[PDB]
Curated annotation (Swiss-Prot):
Binds 1 [2Fe-2S] cluster per subunit. Binds 4 [4Fe-4S] clusters per subunit. This is Iron hydrogenase 1. [4Fe-4S] cluster 4 binds at C300, C355, C499, C503. [4Fe-4S] cluster 3 binds at C157, C190, C193, C196. Its EC number is 1.12.7.2. It is an enzyme of class 1 (oxidoreductase). SMART domains: Fe_hyd_SSU. The keyword Lyase does not apply. Its cofactor is [2Fe-2S] cluster; [4Fe-4S] cluster; Fe(2+). [4Fe-4S] cluster 2 binds at C147, C150, C153, C200. It catalyses: H2 + 2 oxidized [2Fe-2S]-[ferredoxin] = 2 reduced [2Fe-2S]-[ferredoxin] + 2 H(+). The keyword Methyltransferase does not apply. It comes from Clostridium pasteurianum.
């Protein structure tokens, strides 16, 4: 037993944890900034977590272990003067103009400035902001006028992906963060997954904006603007409207999008059922052809970049089905004109994604046919939240509406796509029906669900056993390969997601305060919205989606053949 006194209050504890962890568990206030993902800024620690341990002096609570007989003061004058000084030094390298800033309503640094009444010794007012901003990437942007050099992005990149594509750099004698050799991130091994943005306390890292594309399209009278959101958006945008976590706001998003002036409200979960139509068909074909095995999913652009940059020999093993976003986009410029009379040229398709890598995918040169882009604009969950707020839409009090059904209906298989294992389960529900020409009632594949780094399961399909694997996060893909786990058995189908937890924890998602992250399992609570929708949907197999069956019946023909093979596919050769 340990006896520790914190602010004159006696505590007896069995545990071996840090002063910060103990404080956060016992309602004692200690501020923190550089500590995230169980690591602080080792080199150049922020010291916002300073507490006083009588006898030792000022220590950083985020990495100092509680000890028997320890007497801590978290709020003495010397502690507060030290913390206020460190925030003041950060204010000296921070362009403190919150009014137009994209983190204005949820900035961790603004909260610390208010809390300690910190003031810069000299206001940082850079005249030329172009020497601090890098907007060269199709997915990420850097604004160094806001960077605290707290290292949270560098640690999050290393942990979540193990690429270390985000680095500390010495530009002209001074420390900055950026890509290798200060290149555009797109030209390096970076996966453009945006986990560095998610880890940033301030507006120093952002998504590459597609808001002007959307604004101009809605204002162009001859353009018919389609919008379709990703699985994960309905499970998370409510967080930015003070609704809490795990709230299903699908119906509110549909109404908000109509109020924003979009001409047709569709859903990328329709595109998810399309990807399963093509990919489950392709899996049954590889089974019949005795290979090539394994087949990997090709729907995560972060993973496609990881395969192109680190494992190019695996590219021919990736599924030729386009991702839900791109397969939806292809059909929006071809099928959707045939059932509406719209000129293909006038259809402008916008998606809402939990992801920054999806902007890169949408802008890949060959993701078009006959000069028409599959996808014209991709805005993140955060960008749509700002669009709703700028338009003064009372999101939390909106009435529910439904999507327009032709490319808006989705099955429960499409609904779970945003969670790790979702694509795998959805694909198996169709591939087993397809391969043994039946309609099976047992459709839940709980063995591929959950937050484990690497998951596997043996599935019997048409009286033969097959091995599937789900790789949860880019660092776990590297582990799977480098450890030789890939060679313990013959894998036949492997799902790979670059973000830990799947797309519900994507790089374009709502930022979450580090205090709420320790209290709430964000990956499980966001994913639960999607599994609950599946549980309550009438159709739970992709091939039973009524709107999709008539789309293939009337326009595409059979999946994986003819017109479907001809335009709904994409294969990478580098
Ligand atoms: O971003 C992201 Fe995702 O694996 C999510 O949510 S799940 Fe997807 O196949 C695609 O495209 C689908 O459907 S990638 C998204 O929209
Ligand atoms: S990053 Fe935070 S403190 Fe800095 S200008 Fe933006 S809102 Fe204000
Ligand atoms: S986008 Fe992903 S891979 Fe690139 S620097 Fe950020 S965390 Fe690292
Ligand atoms: S970009 Fe953000 S997370 Fe990275 S060092 Fe700067 S303030 Fe910290
Ligand atoms: S896991 Fe989803 S959010 Fe993350 S990079 Fe892949 S597609 Fe984007
Ligand atoms: S939060 Fe402890 S040194 Fe930064």
């Amino acid at each position: 037993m340990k006896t520790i006194i914190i602010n004159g209050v006696q505590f007896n504890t069995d545990e071996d944890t840090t002063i910060l962890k103990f404080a956060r568990d016992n309602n004692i206030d200690i501020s923190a900034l550089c500590f995230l993902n169980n690591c602080n800024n080792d080199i150049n620690k922020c010291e916002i977590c300073t507490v006083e341990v009588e006898g030792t002096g000022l220590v950083t609570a985020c990495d100092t272990l509680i000890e028997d007989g320890m007497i801590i003061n978290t709020n003495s004058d010397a502690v507060n003067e030290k913390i206020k000084s460190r925030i003041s030094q950060l204010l000296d390298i921070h362009e403190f103009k919150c009014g137009p800033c994209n983190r204005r309503e949820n900035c961790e640094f603004l909260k610390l400035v208010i809390k300690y009444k910190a003031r810069a010794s000299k206001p940082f007012l850079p005249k030329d902001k172009t020497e601090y901003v890098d907007e060269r990437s199709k997915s990420l942007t850097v604004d160094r006028t806001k960077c605290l050099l707290c290292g949270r992005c560098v640690n999050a990149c290393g942990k979540n992906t193990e690429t270390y594509a985000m680095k500390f750099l010495n530009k002209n004698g001074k420390t900055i963060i950026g890509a290798e050799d200060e290149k555009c991130f797109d030209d390096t091994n970076c996966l453009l997954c945006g986990q560095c943005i998610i880890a940033c306390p301030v507006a120093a890292l952002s998504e590459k904006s597609h808001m002007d594309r959307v604004k101009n399209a809605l204002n162009a009278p001859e353009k018919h603007v389609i919008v379709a959101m990703a699985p994960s958006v309905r499970a998370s945008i409510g967080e930015l409207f003070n609704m809490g976590f795990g709230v299903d706001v699908t119906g509110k998003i549909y109404t908000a999008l109509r109020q924003l002036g979009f001409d047709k409200i569709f859903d990328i979960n329709f595109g998810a059922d399309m990807t399963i139509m093509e990919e489950a068909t392709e899996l049954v074909q590889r089974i019949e052809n005795n290979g090539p095995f394994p087949m990997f999913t090709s729907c995560c652009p972060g993973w496609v970049r990881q395969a192109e940059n680190y494992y190019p020999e695996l590219l021919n093993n990736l599924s030729s089905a386009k991702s839900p976003q791109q397969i939806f986009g292809t059909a929006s410029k071809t099928y959707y004109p045939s059932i509406s009379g719209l000129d293909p040229k006038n259809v402008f398709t916008v998606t809402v994604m939990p992801c920054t890598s999806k902007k890169f995918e949408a802008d890949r040169p060959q993701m078009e046919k006959d000069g028409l882009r599959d996808i014209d604009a991709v805005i993140t969950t955060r960008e749509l939240a700002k669009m709703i707020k700028d338009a003064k839409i009372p999101f939390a009090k909106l009435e529910d509406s439904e999507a327009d059904p032709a490319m808006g209906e989705y099955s429960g298989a499409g609904a779970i796509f945003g969670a790790t294992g979702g694509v795998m389960e959805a694909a198996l529900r169709s591939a087993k029906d397809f391969a043994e020409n039946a309609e099976l009632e047992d459709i839940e594949y709980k063995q591929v669900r959950g937050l484990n780094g690497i998951k596997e399961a043996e599935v019997e399909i048409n009286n033969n056993k097959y091995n599937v694997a789900v790789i949860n996060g880019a660092s776990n893909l590297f582990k799977f390969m480098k450890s030789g786990m890939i060679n313990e058995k013959q894998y036949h189908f492997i799902e790979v997601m670059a973000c830990h937890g799947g797309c519900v924890n994507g790089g374009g998602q709502p930022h979450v305060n580090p205090k709420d992250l320790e209290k709430v399992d964000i990956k499980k609570v966001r994913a639960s919205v999607l599994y609950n929708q599946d549980e309550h949907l009438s159709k739970r197999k992709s091939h039973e989606n009524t709107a999709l069956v008539k789309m293939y019946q009337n326009y595409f023909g059979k999946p994986g053949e003819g017109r479907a093979h001809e335009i709904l596919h994409f294969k990478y050769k580098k």
